[PDB]
Design a protein around this ligand. Structure first.
Ligand SMILES: *[C@@H]1O[C@H](CO)[C@@H](O)[C@H](O)[C@H]1NC(C)=O
Lengths: 39, 196
């Protein structure tokens, strides 16, 4: 696991983009970076 | 024979940070204190000596790296830093000798509805070497299943867009960044400050 939550987080980022929440998307992108840096 | 710093700083279109541009500057004279005062910069941090000390120095080459990032990411353009931009987009060596220059470009690089011309790398299997440039767009395997070159579950396109909008907060607004490297080889130093 960890796979399922990363995918939903990626999908929220992509959806916040298309819904014009550009700043909100970038804040999730930051989380995707910090998350995948952990073992 | 003035150094063509105007072509870098006053360029119409800056590059995405993951595909950062590099201009080699040579065989010319440059007033670095005039560069310091030619515009209002939010960052002008030199790690060797100051603008005024550069004006008495000569160098073999000067490399001007330019790109656009978020204001809150300019901190990563410094030696010893880690982060999404420093790990996966543009990395400075620990022994860096040069200047990092940056200014707000919300008036140029933001757009109503979102400017998607500027990209950044979100995923990478390992951190970049100093001054390494990675422009590949292989699908990133984030999970345990192979991706076979197709986007899908835990299989992501490695690049994302900033989507700059003029109504972003200051920390998310676009900043144009110019990084100057001062190269002194065992060779004629032909890039000299205005008072060498
Ligand atoms: C950019 O253009 C302005 C106006 O033409 C000029 O005053 C300024 O010195 C230029 N910047 C550089 C680095 O040459």
């Amino acid at each position: 696991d960890k796979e399922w939550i990363l995918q939903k987080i990626y999908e929220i980022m992509r959806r916040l983009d298309e819904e014009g929440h550009g700043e909100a998307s970038l804040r999730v992108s930051d989380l995707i970076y910090e998350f995948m840096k952990r073992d | 024979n003035l150094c063509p710093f105007g072509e870098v700083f006053n360029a119409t279109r800056f590059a995405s940070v993951y595909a950062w541009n590099r201009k080699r500057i040579s065989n010319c004279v440059a007033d670095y204190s005039v560069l310091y005062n030619s515009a209002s910069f939010s960052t002008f941090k030199c790690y060797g000596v100051s603008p005024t000390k550069l004006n008495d120095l000569c160098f073999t080459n000067v490399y001007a790296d330019s790109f656009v990032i978020r204001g809150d990411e300019v901190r990563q353009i410094a030696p010893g830093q880690t982060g999404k931009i420093a790990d996966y987009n543009y990395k400075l060596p620990d022994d860096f000798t040069g200047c990092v220059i940056a200014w707000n470009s919300n008036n140029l690089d933001s757009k109503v509805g979102g400017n998607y011309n500027y990209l950044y790398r979100l995923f990478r299997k390992s951190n970049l070497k100093p001054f390494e440039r990675d422009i590949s767009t292989e699908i990133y395997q984030a999970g345990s299943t192979p991706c076979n070159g197709v986007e899908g579950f835990n299989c992501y396109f490695p690049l994302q867009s900033y989507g700059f909008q003029p109504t972003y907060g200051v920390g998310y607004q676009p900043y144009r960044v110019v990084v100057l490297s001062f190269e002194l080889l065992h060779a004629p130093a032909t890039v000299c400050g205005s008072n060498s």
